[PDB]
Subunit: 337 residues, 4 copies
């Protein structure tokens, strides 16, 4: 009895999710796809020899009685809408970042779910399923290094397109950090300062690259997060956590050592795609399994997607300001703990 899923947005990342659910994972199938380009979606269907149905809009897809859950994997803007609809049609929703582009949009979604009595919304922040980040979580829950104090993390890309803009650095990129970091330390943020180092020769005129983002939490944990998307050497994600009595750090992605031409080296990835492939699979499978076994979702909540929208706003504010912007959060609803 496989979970029947409908995909809203046959994008490039929606093409991935369709393929893994189809050819890698267990206990689910894609039966409905809807795309703004109805000829683009119609190609994705013959591609993976799917046995699905193409809809012009989400309404018609959500109206289908086959679909039990939906993958909201289209443009960032077109999320908040598709989501609220799904909650009302009472389907399960896996929503890829962002939950909603506006901190208030995520607030509407919260209220809706709080009504439906249970949890339908899971946000696609995959890092939480990555074994690296999991080991960190494990170590922290065990008090291995006592109380966390500071966190040094980086997030680097070989290069970007002419479409990448200063705000995208804290919106499409630093977003995962913002998500997983607070999950790990179990703390809410508070302030976000932004500091622009000497600009890189690799970055385009309209872009501010690199950037540094300091972030304090209510507890007093200080996080400086480097964001450099034109580093050139590769795609690299670093995270070190200094504690009271010890330090734990995120591993490098497994590689074979090589001794040649006077150097002892490992390999650095070049494609953000390769870095977290395993995390997606574990992610979706948890979505499926959680629905079939518990009648609800389990991953990153809709509240977290809102914590994302707030924080990711104070950051874009400090990008122009240059001052210690504030992060203000509505109290956590009982519904979520």
């Amino acid at each position: 009895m496989s979970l029947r899923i409908g995909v809203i947005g046959t994008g490039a990342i929606g093409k991935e999710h369709i393929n893994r659910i189809t050819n890698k994972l267990s206990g689910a199938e894609i039966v409905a796809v809807t795309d703004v380009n109805q000829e683009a979606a119609q190609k994705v269907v013959e591609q993976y020899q799917l046995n699905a149905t193409v809809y012009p809009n989400d309404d018609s897809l959500l109206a289908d009685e086959n679909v039990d859950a939906v993958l909201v994997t289209s443009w960032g803007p077109a999320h908040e809408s598709s989501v609220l609809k799904a909650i009302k049609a009472q389907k399960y929703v896996f929503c890829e970042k962002p939950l909603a582009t506006t901190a208030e949009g995520c607030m509407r979604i919260v209220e809706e779910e709080i009504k439906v009595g249970k949890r339908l919304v899971q946000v696609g922040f995959m890092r939480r399923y990555d074994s690296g980040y999991v080991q960190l979580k494990e170590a922290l829950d065990n008090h291995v290094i006592g109380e966390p104090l500071m966190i040094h993390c980086a997030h680097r890309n070989p290069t970007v397109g002419d479409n990448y803009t200063t705000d995208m650095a804290v919106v499409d990129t630093l977003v995962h950090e913002i998500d997983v970091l607070h999950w790990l330390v179990n703390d809410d943020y508070e302030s976000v300062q932004v500091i622009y180092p000497k600009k890189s020769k690799n970055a385009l005129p309209h872009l501010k690259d690199p950037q540094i983002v300091v972030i304090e939490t209510k507890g007093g944990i200080v996080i400086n997060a480097e964001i450099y998307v034109n580093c050139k050497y590769g795609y690299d994600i670093q995270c070190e956590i200094v504690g009271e009595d010890g330090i734990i750090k995120l591993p490098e992605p497994s590689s074979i050592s090589l001794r040649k031409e006077g150097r002892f080296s490992t390999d650095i990835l070049m494609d953000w795609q390769r870095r977290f492939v395993a995390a997606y699979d574990v992610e979706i499978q948890d979505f499926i399994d959680s629905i079939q076994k518990k009648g609800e979702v389990s991953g990153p909540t809709a509240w977290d997607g809102y914590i994302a929208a707030v924080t990711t706003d104070a950051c874009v504010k400090a990008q122009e300001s240059g001052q210690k912007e504030k992060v203000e959060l509505k109290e956590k609803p009982e519904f979520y703990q």
Copy 2:
């Protein structure tokens, strides 16, 4: 249209394969299990809420028209039989090591398959699917380090039971090495010497632990393989390959670094189970996908399982001998390249 698989031997490792095919992988289901303990198998069926059928023997299971393929995952001895039967009943067979306990048993199986026109037998040497070993293969096929010359590998266990015996070191353990090594370098062995170092205090009286196994191939590649199954510190698999112009080495299993009490450390596994979990999943999935897409299997051939049986014999011979035993191989049949 999922591949319908029958499991011969609801062992501990047969319990794993059933669970992954059921709850992790894609496009297949277990519909038949047979165990020598018909009450043991009957528990495995209610366990994973399977919708299968229990058979007293393989004949009755192989006679079932549901099953398309079989997992031969019972005692080592009870393999050769179950396999030859499956080849004759014309089912697909995934056979966990050993292919057959006797170098001639594997020879019977080869001949049968050579008749059935295509490939039905895939041997469960999972290391070939491990990304570490894959990266090595990749590097070698690219001539990164020119011509291989020597190989230094180790294989260590924290401890063993009173059931582990001197021959098991080269039969149940060094077997994977023997398999993957020749696959990597694309060469046939030739001689196997065995050298017993000072015996460990951790090993039991009847056991010779550790052991070292030198192995030459027709090309002139020298392999010294440490085998120490009472190392105590953990479960560790090492493999370094010296070439003409460089050296490549197998990575450690990903872990988080820790700075505490004057030491900078990573974690060493304690359970052989954890080391290759991913390799099994990729393995079985390849079995399934290969059958559905190509009408045959793809993994480690039955010939390789025979190359295993021969080599793993010369080793047990050098264990008593103390001399440079010989490895004699019947020419490779056209069927296999």
Copy 3:
């Protein structure tokens, strides 16, 4: 014929310099000493079998004509006095940090040296002589990573004394990073800013530990240095330089690796005195050789000492004001390049 050296201040560090100059290095000897505790000076001479005069003060010792260079290694606040005297006596001087406790104190010393025509003052910033830091310098000077953009570094101690106070973290501790960083990147500081994270249980109540000091050069390089003098795990110096096209990082001190009880570890030093023992040796040997083979000192200059003093002051400001303070330096007199 060896360089005849007088030591002002025969404490713990003065004794170590006396010992290395006497039993390890080459081309120099101690002919004169003097300490505030004149009795303690007399013991040193016996302890080390010196052939030296024991003067009552620095004026007397500097008066001795058979001494041609002096080591100022006394109580911090006393340094400034002896250095001025030594310059006017026209002797070579190696002064441990601080050169002087105030920016003014340093200016008086610079202005005195510029008179005497050549370099007589070398400041004991030994990190410049450490093999790791030397390598970083070589890479940067070879444009290996293009233009430096950011710097992440840490300075950690297992614990401190009851006497250790909040301001000491920037005046005694961070002072080495302050010197080496701008030396490495050849850029002057423009601003500093202190950020306090959650206090550590390991730090006594009066001490503010850890700290985070953010510093910007004029060129736009953004440094962020972590000071944690109660980290427990050990004594640790980390430094990472992120450039345009690549990243370079300071090495760990050499250690054998251990595989035992589940961990794969290396050692971490506990005693700060073992970390740079080789840099001190090279530092002093350079003071000697550079004199007998150039007629002037070579290492860190009186001006560098001034830079340190100013920046140190700016940090103590930023400390107690939680503000972004400016680092205002007088024009670098061409006498220094």
Copy 4:
């Protein structure tokens, strides 16, 4: 008052020892020299501004009473002669390897020293003074890993000369491992065995490269050492000791890490002369200090030199016979412990 040292053999290595004793170390000077090329000896004295007598031979130089210790650093085969003379002249002698080219040559030197009552001979096996090897020793002496059982080690050169021949791999190259290994584990060798892998394209036709030398101590420790003098990638010394309850390994030389163009690398040395520069310095300084503070040399002994010679012979046997040769040592005269 310094130790007055005469240098027999003023070649490349004799010059380096002359240089360190003159411009780096402490408590000694060169007062006499002599070379087969007497003209070359005269140049050294000018080159290094020595205050030394230039004798025509070792007899003359040993006759000089104002010299009290000598460095034998001449053409290998000449060593034995000078060492015997020096002993009978009752001077302290530091002899570079070999102590003598034959086991008999070494015996004559041992038998001469046992007469003169105390230790005058220290052999230049500098590895014992390397900080890495010193750490391994400390761990073993502290039973950190229990009883040593096996040893894997490698000795690699980028390339060699046209003059380098097959036997040199065990007499010149493997001779350092031969000395340090039995020193580390405090056990005597019992047998050796050579195994040749596929020749390397980098090795000229006349040379047999790489090689594998298997050695067993009396206690049962099984060493296996790889010699590859044409590895191309660099100069590399690796050593791993597998004990009962754990494993310890020699560190890489210190290097900064680099993240660039897809690789995460450290540096590998090319020049063998940079690998042990610190061990030489400590080695000679110990020859000096140990004399003026004990009245006898301390390091590797004439007996150790004998052990080396015997084992070296056994290897050249095992080389050309492809046999498992025995290592027969005379009883260790109690004069040596």
